[PDB]
Curated annotation (Swiss-Prot):
Its main location: membrane. ATP-dependent transporter of the ATP-binding cassette (ABC) family that binds and hydrolyzes ATP to enable active transport of various substrates including many drugs, toxicants and endogenous compound across cell membranes. Transports glucuronide conjugates such as bilirubin diglucuronide, estradiol-17-beta-o-glucuronide and GSH conjugates such as leukotriene C4 (LTC4). Transports also various bile salts (taurocholate, glycocholate, taurochenodeoxycholate-3-sulfate, taurolithocholate- 3-sulfate). Residues 102-127, 226-228, 333-354, 669-705, 791, 905-906 are extracellular. The chain crosses the membrane at residues 81-101, 128-148, 205-225, 229-249, 312-332, 355-375, 648-668, 706-726, 770-790, 792-812, 884-904, 907-927. InterPro entries: AAA+_ATPase, ABC1_TM_dom, ABC1_TM_sf, ABC_transporter-like_ATP-bd, ABC_transporter-like_CS, ABC_transporter_C-like, MRP, P-loop_NTPase. SMART domains: AAA. Changing residue 981 to H: Does not affect subcellular localizattion; does not affect the transport of monoglucuronosyl bilirubin, bisglucuronosyl bilirubin, leukotriene C4, dehydroepiandrosterone-3-sulfate and 17-beta-glucuronosyl oestradiol. One of its GO terms (biological process) is transmembrane transport. Glycans are attached at residues 690-691. This is ATP-binding cassette sub-family C member 3. It is found in: Basolateral cell membrane; Basal cell membrane. Residues 89-372, 655-936 form the ABC transmembrane type-1 domain. Mainly expressed in the liver. Also expressed in small intestine, colon, prostate, testis, brain and at a lower level in the kidney. In testis, localized to peritubular myoid cells, Leydig cells, along the basal membrane of Sertoli cells and moderately in the adluminal compartment of the seminiferous tubules.
Length: 1210
């Protein structure tokens, strides 16, 4: 059958009520990695079926829409979504009415226990029954809610897969104008945004009837307990919905302001990363750092003015429950003097204030989602009802005799409003005749091919065509698959043809040029083929199809003219493979006209000439005018060390204070109730007390001490996470800028810029708000468990068994959930990439009669996300049935221990223990969601930590070794006994060099390819350390002096000119240290006339990569920075390979005239540049051939002479 089947199918009453069938995937995920082939197979939910049902309705209603508009009553998707999925929502309503009405039993059974502990003369059986019936009503409420959630969430995965398939079946029949009116980006956003909103509205649709009920019964059952006063309490819960929203608007304002400053830092980093060569060689690295720090300081201050908007959310979650209990039990005591609080009317009016809170807090979200989704159903109903291509404008069943294409009196217009492109066209191409439709400028002709494929409106006329059609478009379409697929579109591989077709189009050299061969992937996610390459693949698809009629549109566009004749003779023309086909070629040239059997030339939209090429010459009418014209990383567990690194960064001291202020808030709260639970016993023990002031006041103060202490903690985990961000980024930017040259070359820049963008973002704006919620929920649960154990001291035995069961469900859940939420992210993207190709290429997909095949390639892509969405929706139900059993066992054991020990408890303590215990599940579910976000998001402190530790280059400046006074002036660089290599683990690239250069003579370096000439420039600047020997300059080894001082004193006109974005003020000088010289050198380099021309002058803006300035000007720009440096030695590099002579000529005279009194060492990419140099060093395979004059080398027949004859210079 199938190797892996949806487990549900086979399960019994007890494994399908408690979701025990997800157990095996859960155990497997933690230990082994999960892959797309271990995900279960969908039930026979498969898109093919869901889409069928949604379409059937639209058709009935739209078929009846001809009737509905005729009786406007436009067809409505809403009536189809409701007929198709409407009976299922009605079942889900009943599971919600039973959870809503079985959640008010437990608050009312509590009132019976707090009215038993009061009567000593009651048989103990009454108590043990209320303890059991308070666990059964709790079990029946969980196993029902978690079975409504399975239906509401699975219905979401089926609205998205049904409004994502009625859209992809309309894009393939929509007329040309609608595609032109809306950008393809907007049309693939009726699946990306609009269908996905329908999946997220699904959970909050049955809250338009529940929320307005749980809030109208809870207020009634609190009217009975506390009187009209409970109305004040609800006001302080209905006036926090406005306030929490106001904090949120002020947060977005902060986030948008930040997204401006972060994007600036990433851009200056990108430019530093993509130029770390010249930034290091010139000593500019100390300066480009201060530019990045200045932008980081601005980002850090803006994060300080957003701690205050996160302390406010911790105050509402932690201290809002107490404030409703104070306003309510304050108004009640005043409103009338006689009212007396008892345990029932103070701990049953607290368990009924929690049931009101989850529903009243989700009333704002329901209005947002049900209002964003009215916009979507308006868009998803416009696309579904726009006009469609006319299926029978062209006639394919039969044809007029001895012909294939006949159009009589046909006029075609792209749009009803637009001017008609073609008028009364008449054509009758005979079978197998090459007809070339050539016409003058004014374009058109195009409308001939698109008219025949049926893609324009036949306002008047008739078109008849017979046979299969193959269309080569004006702009080619390449599918996202392999080249071998593009060549055979939906065809079986006859090897002979595959050889005949590619080679006949000469794609054979191209296939060898393809790195992966013909099997390579082409498309957006593929090697980018050349424009001419694109046209050839398209022609190939057609030639393989072996179709009866070939409508070719300007295939000969980007093709090489010489190569094109070969394609014409081999495939298009009479001697070519396509010789019995009927071909209509729309071309704009006279070269191929003689070959054509007959030529259809037309003027405006009216045919002018219908004759052979000889006839065209004799006609001499407008034809004459036309002629003249690892595995662990995939699981992702986080080691306990990655949490000791965040702590050391925040501060070990700030971390103690956050805890000792959260263990001081708990005490205050766990005591403020021990005061209510001593005030609610005042009436029983003594008939009347006058102490209501001393008892209201103290409770209000102990509550305010909880609030003062939690705000001080929340403000110390939000100002202690902006000390981690400063410490962690400031060190990545320092180790990375100083990393040795090899790291930049071996490691792609894309990875380094990932760390300075996405990972430094999490460390700053995500971890601090998710560690203030793991703590909040951990302390709402530790307080709740301390009261029960103190009130009934034996409840302790149960805490250790239930804690093991709670840890095990979290360990197995997080591991599996993470893997499933990654397999889903990778899967979702393909569904959208296919839609964009179907909208862009729908004319080739339809003309080759392959529309169905392309509707099934979608269903195999919308049935690969579902196979990973379903396993996740079940996983959050196998956990929610484990946290709910370790939360219903606290209600049974906190009410089976009060009844065992009735004699020592009092009505109030039994109320305080049991009341709290009904709220363990909310706290425990938040602690599992928040512990999972921290483990997923704290991988970032691991990467920032590992990039920061790479090895570093020698000190930029070392004291005690400062450079000697005026050390460069002797100007002689002696290489002595030196050996060097690019990376540890490679063979020496230079060997034992021994040289002495007289100060100032121009020693050119001439070398064979593979002689490591490029090592010479790097070795002098200590980019690469000396493996053995020295490069002492003027008696001073460069090794002893600090790397930075030596580099600044020397001039390098680098091979690649780089202009980082900014100002010519900075590009010429970042330090900026002569006020007037910047112009003088620039004209010396013939650049000032261009600089003065632009009105701005200095500070003319230079784009990213200095793109605005032309390469030639940029090369001189290098000469300019150098012109300012004025060092004793000058080092050129790769002077010219493709650069123009005028700049090249300019450089050599200037460097000869201005750099004359200096040692000049020029590596030479062309031996032509090195002429008249006093002493020339020839290098071969790391050996110096000789040190003598160039003419002398020629007379002595050195390797240089062999190169000189290669140039032929002499």
């Amino acid at each position: 059958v199938d190797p892996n089947p949806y487990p549900e199918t086979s399960a019994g009453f007890l494994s399908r009520l408690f979701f025990w069938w997800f157990t095996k995937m859960a155990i497997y995920g933690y230990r082994h990695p999960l892959e797309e082939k271990d995900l279960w197979s969908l039930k026979e939910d498969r898109s093919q079926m869901v889409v069928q049902q949604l379409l059937e309705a639209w058709r009935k209603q739209e078929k009846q829409t001809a009737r509905h508009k005729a009786s406007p009553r436009k067809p409505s998707f809403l009536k189809a979504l409701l007929a198709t999925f409407g009976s299922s929502f009605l079942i889900s309503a009943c599971f919600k009415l039973i959870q809503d009405l079985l959640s008010f039993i437990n608050p009312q059974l509590l009132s019976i226990l707090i009215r038993f502990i009061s009567n000593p003369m009651g048989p103990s059986w009454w108590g043990f029954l209320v303890a059991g019936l308070m666990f059964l009503c709790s079990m029946m409420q969980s196993l029902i809610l978690q079975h409504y959630y399975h239906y509401i969430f699975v219905t979401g995965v089926k609205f998205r897969t049904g409004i994502m398939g009625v859209i992809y079946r309309k894009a393939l029949v929509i007329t040309n104008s609608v595609k032109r009116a809306s950008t393809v980006g907007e049309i693939v956003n009726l699946m990306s945004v609009d269908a996905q909103r329908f999946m997220d509205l699904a959970p909050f649709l049955n809250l338009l009837w529940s929320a307005p009920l749980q809030i109208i019964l809870a207020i009634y059952f609190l009217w009975q307990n506390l009187g009209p006063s409970v109305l004040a309490g609800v006001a302080f819960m209905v006036l926090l919905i406005p306030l929490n929203g106001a904090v949120a608007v002020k947060m977005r304002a902060f986030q948008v302001k930040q997204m401006k400053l972060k994007d600036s830092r990433i851009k200056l980093m990108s430019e530093i990363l993509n130029g770390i060569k010249v930034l290091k060689l010139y000593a500019w690295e100390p300066s480009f750092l201060k530019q990045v720090e200045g932008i980081r300081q601005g980002e850090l201050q803006l994060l300080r003015t957003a701690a205050y908007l996160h302390t406010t959310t911790t105050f509402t979650w932690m201290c809002s429950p107490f404030l409703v209990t104070l306003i309510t039990l304050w108004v009640y005591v005043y409103v009338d003097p006689n009212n007396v609080l008892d345990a029932e009317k103070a701990f049953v009016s607290v368990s009924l204030f929690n049931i009101l809170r989850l529903p009243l807090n989700m009333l704002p979200q329901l209005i947002s989602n049900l209002t964003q989704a009215s916009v979507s159903l308006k868009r998803i109903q416009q696309f579904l009802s726009q006009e469609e291509l006319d299926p029978q404008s062209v006639e394919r069943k039969t044809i007029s005799p001895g012909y294939a294409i006949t159009i009589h009196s046909g006029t075609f217009t792209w749009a009803q409003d637009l001017p008609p492109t073609l008028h009364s066209l008449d054509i009758q191409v005979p079978k197998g005749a090459l007809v070339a439709v050539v016409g003058p400028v004014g374009c058109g002709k195009s409308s001939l091919v698109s008219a025949l494929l049926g893609e324009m409106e036949k306002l008047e006329g008739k078109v008849h065509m017979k046979g299969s059609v193959a269309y080569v478009p004006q702009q080619a379409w390449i599918q996202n698959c392999t080249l071998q697929e593009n060549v055979l579109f939906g065809k079986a591989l006859n090897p002979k043809r595959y050889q005949q077709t590619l080679e006949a189009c000469a794609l054979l050299a191209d296939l060898e040029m393809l790195p992966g061969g013909d099997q390579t992937e082409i498309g957006e996610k593929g090697i980018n083929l050349s424009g001419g390459q694109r046209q050839r693949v398209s022609l190939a698809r057609a030639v393989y199809s072996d179709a009866d009629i070939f409508l070719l549109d300007d295939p000969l566009s980007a093709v090489d003219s010489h190569v094109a004749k070969h394609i014409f003779d081999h495939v298009i023309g009479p001697e070519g493979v396509l010789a019995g086909k009927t071909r209509v070629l729309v071309t704009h040239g006279i070269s191929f006209l003689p070959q054509t059997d007959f030529i259809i030339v037309l003027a405006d939209g009216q045919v002018s000439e219908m004759g052979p090429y000889p006839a065209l010459l004799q006609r001499n009418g407008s034809f004459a005018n036309f002629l003249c014209n690892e595995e662990k990383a995939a699981i992702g567990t986080v080691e306990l060390s990655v949490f000791w690194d965040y702590a050391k960064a925040v501060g070990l001291c700030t971390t103690l204070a956050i805890c000792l202020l959260y263990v001081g808030q708990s005490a205050a709260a766990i005591g403020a109730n021990v005061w209510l639970s001593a005030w609610t016993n005042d009436a029983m023990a003594d008939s009347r007390q006058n102490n209501t002031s001393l008892r209201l006041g103290v409770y209000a103060a102990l509550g305010i001490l909880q609030g003062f202490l939690v705000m001080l903690a929340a403000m110390a985990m939000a100002a202690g996470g902006i000390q981690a961000a400063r410490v962690l980024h400031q060190a990545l930017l320092h180790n990375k800028i100083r990393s040795p040259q090899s790291f930049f070359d071996t490691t792609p820049s894309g990875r380094i810029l990932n760390c300075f963008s996405k990972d430094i973002y999490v460390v700053d704006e995500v971890l601090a708000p998710v560690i203030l919620m793991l703590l909040n929920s951990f302390f709402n649960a530790i307080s709740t468990l301390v009261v029960i154990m103190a009130s009934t001291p034996l409840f302790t035995v149960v805490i250790l068994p239930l804690a093991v069961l709670y840890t095990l469900v979290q360990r197995f859940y997080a591991a599996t959930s993470r893997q499933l939420k990654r397999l889903e992210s990778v899967s979702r993207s393909p569904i959208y990439s296919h839609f964009s190709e179907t909208v862009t290429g729908a004319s080739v997909i339809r003309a080759y009669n392959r529309s169905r095949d392309f509707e099934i390639i979608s269903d195999t892509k919308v049935d690969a996300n579902q196979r990973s969405c379903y396993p996740y929706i079940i996983s959050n139900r196998w956990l929610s049935i484990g946290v709910e059993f370790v939360g219903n066992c606290v209600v049974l054991f906190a009410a089976l221990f009060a009844v065992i020990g009735r004699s020592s408890l009092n009505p109030g303590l039994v109320g305080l223990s049991v009341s709290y215990s009904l709220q363990v599940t909310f706290a425990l579910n938040w602690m599992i969601r928040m512990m999972s976000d921290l483990e997923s998001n704290i991988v970032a402190v691991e990467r920032v930590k590992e990039y920061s530790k790479t090895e570093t280059e020698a000190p930029w400046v070392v004291e005690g070794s400062r450079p000697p006074e005026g050390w460069p002036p002797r100007g002689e660089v002696e290489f002595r006994n030196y050996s060097v290599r690019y990376r540890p683990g490679l063979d020496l690239v230079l060997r034992d060099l021994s040289l002495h250069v007289h100060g100032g003579e121009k020693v050119g370096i001439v070398g064979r390819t593979g002689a490591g000439k490029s090592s010479m420039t790097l070795c002098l600047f200590r980019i690469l350390e000396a493996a053995k020997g020295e490069i002492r300059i003027d008696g001073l080894n460069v090794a002893d002096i600090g790397l930075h001082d030596v580099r600044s004193q020397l001039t390098i006109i680098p091979q690649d000119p780089i202009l980082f974005s900014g100002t010519l003020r900075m590009n010429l000088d970042p330090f900026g240290s002569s006020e007037e010289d910047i112009w003088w050198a620039l004209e010396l380099s013939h650049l000032h006339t261009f600089v003065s021309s632009q009105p701005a002058g200095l500070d003319f803006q230079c784009s990213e990569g200095g793109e605005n300035l032309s390469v030639g000007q940029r090369q001189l720009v290098c000469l300019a920075r150098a012109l300012l440096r004025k060092s004793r030695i000058l080092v050129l590099d790769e002077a010219t390979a493709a650069i123009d002579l005028e700049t090249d000529n300019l450089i050599q005279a200037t460097i000869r005239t201005q750099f004359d009194t200096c040692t000049v060492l020029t590596i030479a990419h062309r031996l032509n540049t090195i002429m008249d140099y006093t002493r020339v060093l020839v290098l071969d395979k790391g050996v110096v051939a000789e040190f003598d004059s160039p003419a002398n080398l020629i007379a002595a027949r050195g390797i240089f002479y062999g190169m000189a004859r290669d140039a032929g210079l002499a």
